[PDB]
Structures are given as structure tokens and as C-alpha cells.
């Protein structure tokens, strides 16, 4: 399946406003209030084809969003009895199989913490606390969920489909992980094995160590390589002389066959 997602942040400062858009794990647009002439801008080649009307509609939506988020920030201050800087984050996204909407998201956090989220039914809200219950009641009364659903099932699906056509050359690729194991004897006398997956796209991957058929492990987060691809590693500490009993297993949509690696 594929997703189209917007990640939005507003930050009060003793207010900066940013939007980023992604298809799957590729950023394709960005808006930043602190720019000299703030406007929506391309971050992938394939979106530059779009006409002037695309950019101006997007810029104007961003600017309206900015104003809504300034009110949001101010209101949240009141609900929580605060005086400092504060962040409101929003994510809105559709996940589509090949036209059916697998899953829709429309959710917010305040100061890094869950605030409110549209449920999987795309009809009801989950509020994190009694402040967020005030929003949930107002949004119930305004029919917010119906309009948010119509975006997620309508415009979001139709635009993802156009992006996937526009950027087909880059968006439909699957870059397999190139994997290897490194070995490091520790001054404590035992051995660190680390299983690396490099150069893969998309970001989703499974990386695990096994011993004698049983899953085991420090595992890092998928980190960007900077060129559109991802990296990940997983580590185990193993007794000296026992390295060969350990196998690293990697699965990723881009692979003819799951990888099994050993030192």
C-alpha cells in the first residue's frame, strides 16, 4: 500500500509554523513561516511539474492553517492554565491499498503529548484528557469528523494517485537492504555482533537476531542516509567463540528472499 501524509508543527516563541508533506517516506513539499516570502515549496523534482494554481492553493491553505494554529496555541494555553514556548503537532494522512482506504489519520499533540485523534471509524474522536474533551464536544457539534473523513476518503486518495503517477520513476522503486555483520570484542572479554541493513527504501523493515531458532538485543531506529534511503542496525553481545550460533534475519518488501546472515 502507499500513504500520503502531512506533518504540521506550530511553535510559540516568547509563532513559527511549518508543514511537511510525504508520499510514503519521501518528502515532496514544505512550508515554513520563517522564510523570507513564505510559500509552499517542492522538495522532490517530480512535483515541480505542477502548475501555478497548485502552489497558490497550497500556499493559501497553509496560511489559513497557520492562523487556525495560532488560535489553537492560545486556546490550549487557557485549557491547561499556562502562562514560555509550546508546540502543537498535527498529522493527517491516508493509507491506500491498490483505491480502498486502508487507514485514515487526523490527530494532534500538545507539548509532545497526545491531545485528540480521529478514531479508525473516521466518525468519532479520542480525547487524551479533560481539556481535549472540550475540543471533542465542540468538534462533535460542528460535524468536524464528517469533513475530515471526506478529505481522507476523497481528496487525499485522489491526490496520492496523481502523485504516484507523477513520481512513478522514484516512488514505486524498492531498494533492497544490503546487509553485513560486524564483530567487536569487548574489553569485558565477550563479543558484540552488529547486523547492518543499508541503502533500503521504503523505511519499513524487520531486522532480528536469532539463536537456535529463537528470537533475541539492542535495536536502533531507522535513520535516513540523506539520499532517500534508510539504515538500521541491531546488536547482540555473545560469548567469545560462539559467534557462529547467531544468525541475523532481514525482511523487506524489496527482497526476492528473506536474508539470513552470520558472522
Amino acid at each position: 500500500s502507499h500513504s500520503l501524509r502531512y506533518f504540521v508543527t506550530a511553535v510559540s516563541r516568547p509563532p513559527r509554523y511549518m508543514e511537511v508533506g510525504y508520499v510514503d517516506n519521501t518528502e515532496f513539499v514544505r512550508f515554513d513561516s520563517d522564510a523570507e516570502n513564505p510559500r509552499y515549496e517542492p522538495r522532490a523534482r517530480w512535483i515541480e511539474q505542477e502548475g501555478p494554481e497548485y502552489w497558490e492553493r497550497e500556499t493559501r491553505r497553509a496560511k489559513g492553517n497557520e492562523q487556525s494554529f495560532r488560535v489553537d496555541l492560545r486556546t490550549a494555553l487557557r485549557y491547561y492554565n499556562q502562562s514560555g514556548s509550546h508546540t502543537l503537532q498535527w498529522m493527517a494522512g491516508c493509507d491506500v491499498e491498490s483505491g480502498r482506504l486502508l487507514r485514515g489519520y487526523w490527530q494532534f499533540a500538545y507539548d509532545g503529548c497526545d491531545y485528540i485523534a480521529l478514531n479508525e471509524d473516521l466518525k468519532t474522536w479520542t480525547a487524551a484528557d479533560m481539556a481535549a474533551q472540550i475540543t471533542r464536544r465542540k468538534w462533535e457539534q460542528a460535524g468536524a469528523a464528517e469533513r475530515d473523513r471526506a478529505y481522507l476518503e476523497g481528496e487525499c486518495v485522489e491526490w496520492l494517485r496523481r502523485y504516484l503517477k507523477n513520481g512513478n520513476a522514484t516512488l514505486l522503486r524498492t531498494d533492497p537492504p544490503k546487509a553485513h555483520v560486524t564483530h567487536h570484542r569487548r574489553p569485558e572479554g565477550d563479543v558484540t555482533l552488529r547486523c547492518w541493513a543499508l541503502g533500503f527504501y521504503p523505511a519499513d523493515i524487520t531486522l532480528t537476531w536469532q539463536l537456535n531458532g529463537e528470537e533475541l538485543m539492542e535495536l536502533v531506529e531507522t535513520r535516513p542516509a540523506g539520499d532517500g534511503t534508510f539504515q538500521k542496525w541491531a546488536s547482540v553481545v555473545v560469548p567469545l567463540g560462539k559467534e557462529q550460533k547467531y544468525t541475523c534475519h532481514v525482511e523487506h518488501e524489496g527482497l526476492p528472499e528473506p536474508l539470513t546472515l552470520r558472522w
Binding site: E19, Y54, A76, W139, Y151, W159
Partner: peptide
């Protein structure tokens, strides 16, 4: 095109 957060907190 993209999403509008019309409804305020």
C-alpha cells in the same frame, strides 16, 4: 489539495 484544520480547539 492537502488538509485544512478549519475547526479550532
Amino acid at each position: 489539495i492537502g488538509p485544512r484544520a478549519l475547526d479550532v480547539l
